[PDB]
Amino acid sequence: MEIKEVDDRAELLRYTNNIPLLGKLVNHQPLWSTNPKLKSFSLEKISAPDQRRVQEALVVKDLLNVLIGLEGTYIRYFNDYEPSDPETPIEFKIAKKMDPSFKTFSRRIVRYGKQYMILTRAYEKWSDTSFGMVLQRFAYEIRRFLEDVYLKTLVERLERDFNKVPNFSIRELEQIINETEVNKQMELLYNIYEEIFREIEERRTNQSSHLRLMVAFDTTVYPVPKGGAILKIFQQKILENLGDRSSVMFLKKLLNNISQDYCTMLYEWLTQGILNDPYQEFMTYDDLERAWDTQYFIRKDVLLRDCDSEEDKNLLFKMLRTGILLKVVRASLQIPTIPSNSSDITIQEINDFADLMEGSNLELYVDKCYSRANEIFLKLFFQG
Amino acid sequence: SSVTLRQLSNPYYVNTIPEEDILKYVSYTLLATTSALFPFDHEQIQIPSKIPNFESGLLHLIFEAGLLYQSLGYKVEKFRMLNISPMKKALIIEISEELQNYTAFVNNLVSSGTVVSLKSLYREIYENIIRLRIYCRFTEHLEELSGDTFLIELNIFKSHGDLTIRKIATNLFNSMISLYYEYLMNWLTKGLLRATYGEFFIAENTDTNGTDDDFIYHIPIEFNQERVPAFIPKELAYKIFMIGKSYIFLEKYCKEVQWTN
């Protein structure tokens, strides 16, 4: 195919004030559709049954690029694609002059490149501090997935077979993608994306829409669901994948690797009385960051459970009180931390969120923490 | 059939440069050096028409590392010539270490001979790209910016959900806080304010107008409460201030030299 001249020069982007911490810092390549570097070859010319395999070879070469988010020579980014725009949806168009059987395979394969790019871009957006550590860890896991699973499979298996295997074919690509279940993993991630995304849009849309404790609610709904608001998505998705052991296993693993810092934060609150929430994802926030009798606020929107039932309200308050008593003790003793040997009650870290949320376990975990907080507190008050 | 699809697609790409040749010059691009295939201009990499846009899209994704590398290398070289706070040197040094690790990694991939394609290469260096991007953004403002501000920002990032980010922020933080600690020691053990470049909350103030030019009524030490870092209790910062002031008083005016030493 004849070569066309395009002044293709790679450079770093000048404006970073509008780029997420993990966003791309390099200009996109010139597009085929406006600046092809090659005269195209109509595939019509090789539609013949004896040349048909060649047509397929050319099509597969594009599919490999489509899967990693690049346009090809027969499959192109659609008409409104705008590579400099983080908000532009991406669709692909398939050259009309193509064997119709390939055109249908292509649509089925192409959709994954679409998901790939979306997930890629989404995790980059989520690298901002504005989204919270729960989402950021998820964004991490997405990125990690793509590096180690998606692309690894693609290169080790598909690029490799394209280059090395006689009888390698387009029908095989479909089989392999499903064979490794990478598409299910992506489909789940994609659907999580869609769920959070639509949730964000709903939130964005809705701009107009006994204990001696200073406990106020903060009914603010955040544009970005954070903390429990995210963890709930995962829980709900698991509940929608019931019976698919592979899928739920994946989702559970994933959730436990997302909730890990959340759990740590909760643990310290409950065993140390330490509030440390730089991204404002934890319920129970207060002022100042003397004057110790400050108000505590409950971010209803980041809660793991509703606070409408009596039982969960009671649990929430117990968790709150637990940390407060510990906070008092740390202040009173002028210590950074309360050691495990400060009491006869020792409490293990939360290392499995999903398990903690299985029912009853949370209440007991908290009760143990609470009991401990009182043991320590009372010893101080009646001895110290 | 008897051939792979690559063999069949081949005859249409005969006018273009194969991946073998591209890989032979990629290692140079990745270290931001120039080459015969990819002349590396001051800030741009020239891609020949002989490499289709099909592959160019990947090369941009790959080449970004070389460009980021270059940018960080310049940040290092610029600052290497300046009289700056040790706190910045700590950041700079960490950048140089990252660049050294980057380099070794890249050289190892190339020398291993196991990279046979660009898709493979890209995937293999994917993480390094991410790491450089993180640093590149952290160094974006490494100019007109104090050491404490950086420590604060890093503390935010130390809590970031992304594992790579928190590791990087942590390492940068630790490299810098170590020298912050040294400032505290100089003050606490010597009453010394040295090489702070305005990046330490306790300051010398000898800008007098006859109001004790000889420092017999006051010791020309003051501190900015607003510059006390987040990790030091304000009350303690006060004690720190007073210890060094007391040190000075005793050593300089009371001449309690044997004791003080």
Swiss-Prot record, chain A:
Keywords of this entry: Cytoplasm, Cytoskeleton, Microtubule, Nucleus
Subcellular location: Nucleus; Cytoplasm, Cytoskeleton, Microtubule organizing center, Spindle pole body
Annotated GO biological process: cytoplasmic microtubule organization; meiotic cell cycle; microtubule nucleation; mitotic cell cycle; regulation of microtubule nucleation; spindle assembly
Any one Gene Ontology cellular component term annotated for this protein: spindle pole body
GO molecular function, one term: gamma-tubulin binding
Top-rank lineage group of the source organism: Eukaryota
Quaternary structure, from the entry: Interacts with TUB4, SPC72 and SPC98.
Note: Present with 2230 molecules/cell in log phase SD medium.
Protein purpose: Involved in microtubule organization by the microtubule organizing center, the spindle pole body (SPB). Probably part of the microtubule attachment site at the SPB.
Family: Belongs to the TUBGCP family.
Name the UniProt record assigns to this protein: Spindle pole body component SPC97
Curated annotation (Swiss-Prot), chain B:
Subunit structure: Interacts with TUB4, SPC72 and SPC97.
Miscellaneous note of the record: Present with 56 molecules/cell in log phase SD medium.
Name this protein carries in UniProt: Spindle pole body component SPC98
Localization in the cell: Nucleus; Cytoplasm, Cytoskeleton, Microtubule organizing center, Spindle pole body
Function text: Involved in microtubule organization by the microtubule organizing center, the spindle pole body (SPB). Probably part of the microtubule attachment site at the SPB.
UniProt family annotation: Belongs to the TUBGCP family.
Top-level division of the source organism's lineage: Eukaryota
